[PDB]
Each structure stands twice: as C-alpha cells, then as structure tokens.
Amino acid sequence: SGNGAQGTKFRISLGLPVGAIMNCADNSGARNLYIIAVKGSGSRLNRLPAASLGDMVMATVKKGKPELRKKVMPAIVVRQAKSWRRRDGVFLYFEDNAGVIANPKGEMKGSAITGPVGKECADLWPRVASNSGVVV
Amino acid sequence: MATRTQFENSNEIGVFSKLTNTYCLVAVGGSENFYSAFEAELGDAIPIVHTTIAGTRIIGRMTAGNRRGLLVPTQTTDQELQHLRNSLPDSVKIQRVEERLSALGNVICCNDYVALVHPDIDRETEELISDVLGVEVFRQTISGNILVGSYCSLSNQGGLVHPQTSVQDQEELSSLLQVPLVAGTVNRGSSVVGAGMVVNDYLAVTGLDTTAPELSVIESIFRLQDAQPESISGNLRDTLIETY
Amino acid sequence: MQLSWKDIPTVAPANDLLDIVLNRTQRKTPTVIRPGFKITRIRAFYMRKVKYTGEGFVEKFEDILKGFPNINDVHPFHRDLMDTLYEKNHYKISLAAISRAKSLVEQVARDYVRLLKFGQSLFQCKQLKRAALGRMATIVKKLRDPLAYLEQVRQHIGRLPSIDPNTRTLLICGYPNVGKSSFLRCITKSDVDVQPYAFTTKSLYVGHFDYKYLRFQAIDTPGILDRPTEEMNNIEMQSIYAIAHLRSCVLYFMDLSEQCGFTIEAQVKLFHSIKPLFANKSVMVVINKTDIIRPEDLDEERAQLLESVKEVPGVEIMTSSCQLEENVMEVRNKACEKLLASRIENKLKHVAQPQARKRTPFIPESVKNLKKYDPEDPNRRKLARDIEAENGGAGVFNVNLKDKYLLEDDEWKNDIMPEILDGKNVYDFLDPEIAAKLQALEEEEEKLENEGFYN
Amino acid sequence: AKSLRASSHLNAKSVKRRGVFQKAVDAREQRISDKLKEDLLK
Amino acid sequence: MRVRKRQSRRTSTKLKEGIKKKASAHRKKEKKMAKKDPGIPS
Amino acid sequence: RIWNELYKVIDSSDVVIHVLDARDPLGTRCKSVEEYMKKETPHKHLIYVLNKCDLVPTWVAAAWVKHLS
Amino acid sequence: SHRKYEAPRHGHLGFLPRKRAASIRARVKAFPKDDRSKPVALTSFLGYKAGMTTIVRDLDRPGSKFHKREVVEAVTVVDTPPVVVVGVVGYVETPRGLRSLTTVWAEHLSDEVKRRFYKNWYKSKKKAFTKYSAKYAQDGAGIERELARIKKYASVVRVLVHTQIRKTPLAQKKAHLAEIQLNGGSISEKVDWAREHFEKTVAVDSVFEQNEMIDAIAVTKGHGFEGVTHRWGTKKLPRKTHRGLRKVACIGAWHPAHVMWSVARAGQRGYHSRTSINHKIYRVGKGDDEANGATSFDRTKKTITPMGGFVHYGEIKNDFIMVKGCIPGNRKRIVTLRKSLYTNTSRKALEEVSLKWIDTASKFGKGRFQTPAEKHAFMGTLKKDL
RNA sequence: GAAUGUUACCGCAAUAGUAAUUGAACUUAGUACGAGAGGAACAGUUCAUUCGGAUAAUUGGUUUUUGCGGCUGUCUGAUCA
RNA sequence: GCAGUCAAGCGUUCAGCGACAUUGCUUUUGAUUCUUCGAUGUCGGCUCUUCCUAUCAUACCGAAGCAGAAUUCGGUAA
RNA sequence: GUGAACAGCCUCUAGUUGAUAGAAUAAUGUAGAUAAGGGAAGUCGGCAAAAUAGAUCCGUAACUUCGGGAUAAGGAUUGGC
RNA sequence: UUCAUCUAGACAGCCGGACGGUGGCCAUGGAAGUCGGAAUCCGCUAAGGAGUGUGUAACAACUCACCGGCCGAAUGAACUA
Ligand SMILES: [Mg+2]
16 A cells, blocks of 8 residues: 555556556646556566556656656556456446656645546545545 | 544545534444544434445545535445435435536535535536525635535535635635635645535534644634634734744 | 754764674675686676775765764754764864765775776785775774764764754743752653752753643753853853754743852842843743742842842743742743744734625534533443444454434344345335335226237 | 464464354354254254 | 584595695795703692 | 776877867866876876867857967 | 576475376365364265356455445355265274274165276176175174274274265266265264264255355366466567477576476476365355245345356256355366364454345356346347247 | 286375465554654554466457358359358 | 884793784865776676575564664574 | 459469378467557567558658659548449 | 692681771862872771772762681682693
C-alpha cells in the first residue's frame, strides 16, 4: 500500500509498465504523465515494474504547463484500461488509462478530477474520492 | 459540541461517514471504534447504521441526504438500499438516482432547507433531489470550485468553505444559503473542508489533526457551544490575526 | 536546519573510526590474489581496495560534516548558544580540521591510485596499497582530539533545548532560587528541579502552555548576578543572551523574604542594570513567595525601591507564591495579554451574513433528553466497542448488522431475502399491494379465456 | 517477518490451538460421530 | 550444526620439498649471520 | 579520455594555440586550463586565436581583439 | 565469477524426481495423528473429480476489506458416492517401520472389486474369493482368530474400502481399492467398528461436513514429454539461436565436468503425485436431496449439474463434496479426501460459509441460462414447439 | 526391462532431495515515552512482493472443428450447390 | 617510507639488537577542488547450477546520551 | 477472364500425377501465422517482424546548378444496383 | 628457577579505626580529599595517604593503603621447561 494509501490493496492486473504514458485526469494543467518508476514495485530479474488502478507511481509531465516539465512527481492511477477481476464477479476495463499527480501524502493537487474514477482507487485514496465527481 | 475523532488512520471523517440531523452512517471497515466514537456523542438518540455503498468505505462521499431523505448512487446494490431503509425510520426518504455523476456527497452540498448542486447536474436529478429533500436547489460553485460537496460544509446553524473562497463569493453564497459562512481550514490546513469533517445542528466531528484555532472557528461558525452563535468569534479575531 | 538537531550521526573516536573503516575494507572487498594472476588483475584489485578505503573515509567525513548544524548563519540565538557552550572558535576549528582531513584523504587516494596504475609487480602493488592505507591511518590518527571533542558536543547539542524565537514565548528572570523553576513548573507541565540551592537549573528549561487557543512556551533560566558583565560565567551569559536575542516578553522575579540573601536593594539594582535588555521586552515584575511577606506589610522605605522600579514605563508589579499557585494563572494571563497586544500592534505595520436574501435549526427530542457520556462512569453505556472487546476485540468479533436494524416485527428479524427466483430477481418485483395487480391480471385472463383468445 | 520455524509464532499458534481452535475440531468430530452411528442405525 | 570445511592434513609432498629447501636456505642464512653458572640450587 | 588527451597535447606542445569563437569568446575562454598552463608550465606561450570572425560584424571582431590583446 | 546478479532458481528441488506417478491412484503418505480420546471415525474418503463451478457467498471475515460482501470464487465438484468397507488391515510397529500383520475380508467382495483382481475379467473363470469366504463356515474360527490376533498386536487399524464405480457415470466398471486409517482409542473398538461395518456403506456426510478443512491428494494432469521452457519456466533465448532457443543454453562449465542434477533439464511433465492442503469445504450435497444446487437464497428446484451435463463427465445423481479452489487431477480421476492432519481452525477455516448463489449454467460453451426452463422462457416458443 | 514358483491387489520404508521468503492495515495508538515536535512494542486479525505446486470456475489469447456467415478473381451454361 | 626519543626485554662476558608508545614531514574558522597526465593490455553481457562469510536485509542478542522514533559498532547467523 | 501491364491467380489446346510410403502429432527444429495492457523500457546497435503500398482528388517546404526536390510532406474516397 | 611474609599468628575470609592543624593554598555560583593548577608542610599512634575508587551542587555517606580484633599454617610475586 505504502504511505498515504489507507488499508490493504488486493492485487489487480498490472496494465501500466514503466515507461507507459497515460492521460492526465486532473485540472492541474498536465496533459499526460510518463511513468518512470512504480512505488511499491517488486524486485525480480528482468521483470519491469508495473502499476495498476489505485497504485502510486512517479511520473514526469511529457506535455502541458512548462513549469511542470523536467520534474518527476508522484501520481495515482485512476484508470487502467486493462480488464481486471473485481471480487463482485465481473471483469471491467476503462476506455483509456489515466492518472492524477499527487504528493507523497496522497493529497490532490488539482481541485477536480475529470472522467470516471476507478472504485478501487477511490476507496484506497480518500482524497481522490473527495476530489472525484464520478466514480465508475 | 465539537468533538475530535479519527478513522483507522484517516482524518477525512466525511469520506467514511455521513451525519445528518436525524441519522448517521458509518463504514464497516476494521472495527467499531468509529461507531463507538459516534455513539459517545449521539448514543442511542438517533439510529447509527453500518452500511457500505458499491462495496466501498467511501459511502460519505457517495451519498448525500438530510433529515427529510437520503440519496444513493446508481451503483448501490439493492441489498444495501434495503438494509439502509430497514435501519432507518420511515420518516427518512430513500431513493436511488440515475445520472452521469455518482459522487452525490461531492456533487451535492445541502442542508435541511437549501441545497447546492453541480452546475452540470441534469434536470431530472435536480427535480428528484428537490422533491426528496424538500429543499431549494441552486446552481452554484464555491469561488470557481465545481465540487460543491467536497470543498464546503453546510448546516442549518452555519457553513464552512475552503480558504480560497473570495470575500465576494462568500458574501453571495451566504445570502443564497441564508446562513453565515466563514473561510477556514480543517485537519491542520486541509482545504477539503467538506470531506475532513461532518456536522449537524447539534454535533460536529473533525479529524484529530484539527488544530485548536480551527476547532474554535468551527465551533463559533456552526454555533455548537452554548451561548456561542459566532458571538465569541469576535474575540477569536485577535487570535487569528496573531496566528495568521 | 533548526529545532532540535537531534539526528546528527554519531562519530566514533579516531582509533575506533580507523578500526571500523579498515575492518569494512577488509571484509566487504575481496582479499585473495595470487602472483600467478596477470599484473592487470593485481593492479585492479589493489586499486579497488584503495578506492574503497578512500570512499569509506570520505563518506564518514561527509556524514560528520553534514550532520552538524553549520553554526554560522543559523540564527543569532542558536549561534550564540552554541558559541557559549561549545566555544564556537574551537568547534569551527575542529570541523574545519575534519574537512581538511577529508580533502587530504581524497588527494592521497587519488595520487596513490594514479601511482599504482603503473604497478609492475605484486610486491610493488602491495607496498603501494599498504602505503595508501598507512597514509589514511596517520591522517585519521591526527584527528584524535577533534573527534573526541565533537562526539561530546554532538551529544550536548542533541540534548539541548529547541525553542522557536519567532514564536510567542515567556521568559523568567531574577536572582537564583527566587522561584523561576517553581513558576515554570506551576504554569506549564515540565520537569525542572525546584530545590532551594544556589543554582537549581544549570541551563535553559522549556515548557509549553495554551492560552486562548494560542500556543505559548515558557523559558526558565539560571539567572544573573550583580556582576558588571566584565566577569561572568557561561551560565549567566546564556541567560543574558537569551534575554537579548529572544523577542520573548521577560518577567523579572523578586523575593522579598530573608531567603535569596541578595536583599531587595540588590534585586532593584540588578533590575536597573539589566534595564537596557528590558527596553523592548514589555517587562513585568513578579513578586514571588508572597505567602510569607505580603509586601503590603513592607516598610515604606523599602517600598520606595518598588516605586522606583515602577518608574520605568512598561513595567508592572505582580504578586504570587509557590504554595498559592492561583496567582500563576493571573500572571500567565497578564503576560499573554501583553505579548498578544504587542504582536497585534506590530503585525498591522470577518464572517458573512444571510442579509435575509422560514428555516430554523432542528434537534430531536431524544438528543435534548440524551445524557452526557462519561468514560469513567461504571454505569455508562454498553460501548459497542466494549461489546466487541468482550467478544474477542477488533478482527475477531462479527457484528450482526441485523441486530439493530428496524423491522415491523422482530420475530422475522433474522430472515434472508431470496434475491432470485428462476430469473427476474425478487427485488425487481418487490412492491406493496401485489394483490391488486394480481387480481387485475386475473381479471384480464378471465376476459381473454371467455373471449376465446387461447384457441 | 517470521518463518514457520519461528519459535514465538509457533508458541502463539500452540496457545491458539489450546484455545477455541481445538474445541472447534472436537465439536466437529462429535457431530461427525453422530452421523457415523446413524449410518449403521439406518 | 552446519559445520564448515576442515583443513586437510595430507602431507602434499610438494610442500615437503618446498619446506626442505626453505629450511636448508634458512640454516645457511643463520650460519652466515652467526659470523657477523646458576651455582648451588635452592 | 578527452581531458587526458588535452593534458597529453599540452605536455607535448611547446606552444599552445587557443581558438575562440567570435560570438562569445569570453564564455569559451575556459580559464581553468589557462591557470594551470600559467602556473605549472610558464614556458608555454598559450596564444589565443579568434576564430569564426566571418560570422560576426567587423566592428565586433575588432573590439574583441582590441580588448583581448 | 559470482554471476553479477542474484536471482531465485527455477523449480522446486524438493519435488524431484519429476517422474510419472507409480499408479493412477496416489497413495496417502501419512494420516492424521490418532486421538485416543475421540470416537472411531474414518480419516479419509475416495471421490471422483466431476468438474468445477462458480460460487458467490457473503463473506463474514472481520478485519478484511471484503467484510459483508459477496466475493465470487471458484470451487471444485467431486463425485463421492457412499463407500463400502470390505476388509480391515492390522499393522504392528516394528523397528523397521510399520508392518502389515494380516488382513480380513468380509466374506463377500462386490463384483467391482472382483474385477480389480483380474485384467482379462471376461476371459477369467471368476474364481473369486470363494475359498476364503468359505473360512466363514459353520464355526468361522479362522476369521475370529485373525480378528483376535489383530486386537492383540496391531498398533493401528486401517479399513479397506472401494468406491461404488457403478454409481459413477464413468465408463469403466472396475472400482478402486485403497486403505483408510482408523482413528480413536481402544484399538479393539477399531476392529469392532470395522467388523460392524463389514459389507456396510459409509457416506461422506459421516466423514466430512460443511466448513471442514480437508487435504486433497491426486495424480496431476499429464502432458507427456515437455520442453524445459515450460517444464521449468526457463527464459527463452532472443531469436533463432543455434541449437534452438527454447532450452537452457549453458549446461555446465570447466569444473565440474559433469551435469548437475539441478540444471533443470527437459523431461516428463505432469502425472506427478501432489499434496494440496487447507481446502475449505463449501457444500456437502446429499444424493437424494432434490435441488442440491438450491441455496437459502435461490431456493429454485435445480441440481448442481450444469446444463447439458458436466464437460467430459456425467449427470451426478449421488452425494458430492464441494470444496473451494482447485484440486490436482483431471475429470474422471479418482481423488482422495484427507483430513488436515492438524488443527487447521484458523479464522480462514473457523468462519462459516453461506453460499448466496450456485452456478449451474452450461460449462459447454458460453452458456447463459441456468436451467432449461429459463432458456425456454427467454427464447420463448420455437418453430419445432408448435 | 529378463531374473527372486507365476499373476494380481494392498502396503512398510533404508536411502536421495526439500522451502517457502519478505513487506504492510487495523487493533493495542495518538497510549508508554514528550516541554513540545513526534511516536513505541507483544498477543488477534487482514492484505500484499518474489518463489514453488496445481486447474480453466470466470476473463483474455490461440483455430484445421476450416463449425457457421460474408468477400475478390476464375471455372462447373444460369440458380442452388 | 625515511630521519629521531624511551626502553618491557635480549645482550662483544651483563659495547650492540630491540616490543608497546612517541616528534618532523606529505591554507586550522566545514572555505573551496573548476587535477581528471601515458594501465600497450583488455572487458562486459544473454541463459543458467553450486559454494564461502570477510553478513546489505530478514532472525536472536550486547555495548552506545539507546527519553521515543531513528541511528552507530559488535556477537552468532548463508 | 481479372486485371495499367509478357505484373499475381483460374480456366482452354497441349503435356504430366514424376520427388520411397504407412500410424500418431512428444520435446527440439525447418517455413508461415495470431495475441489482453505498455510500445524499444530487450539488444553494442530498431538485428528480425510490423507498419504506408494501386487508382482519383486537395495540397506539397528548406535547398538548388532553376533542371530537380516530389509519389516530398500532410489530408478525403474506392463495393453493388 | 629466583625473590618475599610466617605462632614477635603466613594468604584468604568476617567486624573496628581510617584522626586531629584542616573545610591546607589558587581561582568559585557550588570545589569541605575525590571538576580543574602548584604545594603535597607537621602532631598522635597500631595506622591514617592535603587521599585509592562510588556519590552528593556542597558536604554527608560508602569504600581502599595500612593497621587492629576472630579461626588458623603455609601463602604471595616474577620467570623457565
Ligand atoms: Mg531553584
């Protein structure tokens, strides 16, 4: 789970390997986030770290405000786009993967989140749920 | 009066709970410490129900309601709705809503008389909310903040908004809601006032991180303590000036 | 950094540091090389060993340098405290010596690596590596005294108080044993000796308290004597500089009883001498041990000294006693009011209203009749928390949500909803007065049957 | 972390076994014995 | 319990010859370097 | 490798000829090497040369050479 | 060379050799410790893997994020018709392991076990145990003498049972015969219970019940000769490497000059005996109980048989055991149900299950209907109907 | 896989190998400890990284079932095929 | 490393040898390091097995100004 | 016939059924393919695969020896009656 | 092997003294033997060292070098093999 995350997180499909680009889902001005590392990722030979819905990752802003360029900041994935097994008994996926930049404490930078927010991420991140207008 | 409380290790009281003037909702996560914390102030005076919404502990943000009724998102299962209804008296209306938005607690900020809604909320949802809650509905944003349900707290005694609210915006919103408003912070400077605490006409619950000045401001604005209907806020002016 | 520099890394003496570095180099790095190996392999091995030793020494020295607060340009109060305690000149000299030793080690390692890159025999490379190690050992040994002194000063600074000068704080001044420690103990929760001997507190003591929802911290000091500051101990200099640097409002304590054998004239002379430090502090005079003197029963000639003290504009006289601690609250309130007024005056250098645009607050009668919960009352509520505790505590007790939820009859409270019946789940069909719709459908079926719809 | 051969964890598990853990298995076996006898009584 | 390796005690006659030569050299070196009563017991 | 080659050529050259860019000769002066040249090897002339003068105004190059001479 | 990189090895060295199982029916290596205080009971049972199905149940687990939620998880359905004891085996503790003293048969072996003693059953004259059965003659002293000998010296008692193959939809007519250890004190009572159970049938309900933790042992799925790439998970070589790419490229080194047993070479995969423990039992369905697939919620008169029957299996008509997860071995394979061998009442096992709904839709294709009635109601009347 | 009278069933085990590893969520906790900053630990719980053994419940991928339906050129006179 | 002092001791017969310590060596105010000067010979990587502790972490302990948190060294530990 | 075409495929006259075969479809290979999410993070190195491919229309830059770049580039359609 | 103490009670074990000039001179907030610097003078003994160590702010108190009282006889120190 790591710092900021509340409670335990059940494993889901990892659809965001390191180096993946996901559209920004917050009004902070960023367009897309380039993932360079995954927080809490496992250590294994030749295995590329991968993120998932609700995971905290460090990503750089490839496009958007110039002030946000050249610096890597933590981010929380709100969409994955890869089917994952929900314990309710249904496989679901989002139209496009997306994430929101956040501080190490999980606080949200943007005042609003655009598009649907995954249920797992909202439950695991109280601030994301508070800043999410649409869940699932 | 105002009482400090915390979730497992989260100061966002409003995320995992929803307190009204006649009923309270809490999450079933972990243990009954949150339930016991609420009981220590409300006891058995009003029902306290352990309930989940869409299988999550964020029922506070997912649901919005008042003394007259409660609203739940479309994602709520029928079992949860039935449990909530059975745990609540018939005097509290319960009905599911169908719209693009799902975060009713973040999309709707309302009290027993006046309600604020997201500007993009559909006409049918607005009409249903008005009919169920018996409250006036207005399209507004708190100083450009579209999430009225998360960045503002409202009650019949008073309301609280995030510190970035402009003075003109505060004046307009106070007149529209017919209640006093004060720009402040909760949980040691947290800007999400609507998620960091819950409040009603006679009880307020906030995170442990809430500093003494913030708790005093909340008490003064929401008129919890006896003989403190913002009257003592005048004395708090010097304290705020010194701290600020 | 500031505010309790407690995280300084412990530094071992020169001998211990050298032993640790040598042991780490011998253990972590390989130690087996043979003459039959190529000269390149031996050269690489010895160069790697020398580089590892140099890197370890450099890392240790860098950690020691970084850990310390960098006394220069930290803060006048903290800088002066460090100067008075650790002899800032010697402290800076020792840290500069450590930095110089680090650079010397770096240069030695680089030069020896360059020399060894041209090694031609196993013995030559071994001798060069031994020479580099010996040079590093001698450099470390030359650091004997500074490391020992720095260990002690690091311990002391880690154990020093951490006061914020920018915050609103109180300060107690007066002769030793006048009651400064007693006042600090009574006003705020703190651990300070209250013995009557000459110098009870040998350093500064800090205690926090809250007034009007504002955080305040009280500072106690050993005190000062009537010396003209030409000759003075570091203990008195600490108090003098704490008064000088800190914006805190200072309170001058006095004892009119036979105790504190510096008479009232001596106390007034000390107050007059320290007056220059009292210009901007908004000082207040506190007469302690009032329980045994009651200055109202004081000679007029002696009260002349109190009047002369009062001649200063911003001073005021307060009465308090250790046994009668009730006056401590009044003194605290007066000091807090003065400090807040001064800060508000220096700072300058709101709610909305409905306006009328019926709605009134609503409280259920049960809440009005509800009784306040008492955690220490044996007859308090059941405490569903305690109910879970008696059933195994958190993570074991299973809460039956059906226990409390309301239903028309408790006789069917522990029932189950089928939720499904061969498709078209029950919840969809759940609706009161099913009999009316069923009867209407039956009437429609009866009409169809006699109409010949089903041939 | 502690392995299976961790003495403290093994002692805690043993104490739990002496707790209601073993009583549950005893009750299960007692219930099974009734059906075993019924298999012949029938 | 997990005993480590033990040094072999085999003669390894190569070492025999090496030590013999070393001792022969050492005796000559000592010889070359050489050139350069308790009373009544109690 | 590049710094080693620089030192090798410096030690193997009786005279060192330093080229400069007329656009920004001062920024390209790289004083670090010149101090070592002056200190350790006084006998090395270390002569400057203003290159790329054809890409700058004539008065600019004239002023540069006047101020650097 | 220290490999410059430390990584875990491929495969488990404790499961070697990776060879085919000795027999289709895996033999139990160990049995639960005999509790002298407890009454006599059967320590295991023999069943046949019928298939798998989906189950949704409200999970009661304090402290978990899924408390009071319906978590969907897989279960295995094993056909387990009542078993009949046809003998008893006595073992005497010797300095060289347990040794079989003698065995007694119950005067009457079923044709199913008679087939087990012959390969060409139809050609055989069927000269069955008749001679030994004649030992039950007027006096029958031999049987009583053997029973007394077992009582005198046997330290543990194991009963001989065989599954009612004829009750199984399996095409084969030969049944499986295996021993099951008897627990409880008074070893004389063990043989007395065995004798009273001679020729009698024991149902699974008298051995296992709902929420009981059991360990399943069976022969794993066989796949024949398999490449080292899948047999051990070896990393594939980049492309078109000489001598192929789906193999371990480096097999040895200068020293030692021999291939180590741990190099994880290619070989037979599957068909190896495996032991799986801590399998939670979710449903114990009676053979004669109609609507076996009906829970307290569904309450629909439907059995657990999937529409069109189980894939590569029949139309289960008798008692069956439902256990969560999966069990090694293919459908139609005999699987032995064994106790946990220890107190496995961890809160995972102590928690009581409550199935909200049982999946009975066709596993043959993308079945969408649970029962034919639902299919007819949805699709309605067809051309052939009228 | 022959050989130990033969076939078959059920077994014991000398011997060889072995394994699981680590982190975090509550409770205990904002309690001991603290002037404040802050922050313990055991027992009971719940998840998670890596590794090992199984199985396709459900989802994805794979198609020579060439199973079904469609499309270009061309041939069987046209259609079907 | 070289150049010196002292001797617990050995001792041309007890003048000479000599252990542990010790002085000179290679900008005192954390300031800088903008030197980084010739390896005549390769090293560095894909799959993968084992072994050593001279132990990075997990496990169990002692000593450290170890109030807590946190950190340093040491003992066993592959 | 299809088709810009002596481009690829089918058929007509004409010429052949010649390449040791039978029974399964284990691992590893020879030749050709498909793939959930990321899209070069693998490798010394985009090594190999893949991607646009014909026709019609809009439109086409730096440079230049003014001849070229050019099918630059960047975009919209293609079936049957 | 070489040196020491010894029924003028050997070593080690238990109890008492361990004084008075005196709290000796410099600094001192506090420095009484035991934070630091020069002295480290003299009386009564069987003995008391301007103090061997623990601890107090300061003494106080405990304790050691020695001596004294109880038992009694070998004991202690440095080296060689
Ligand atoms: Mg005092």
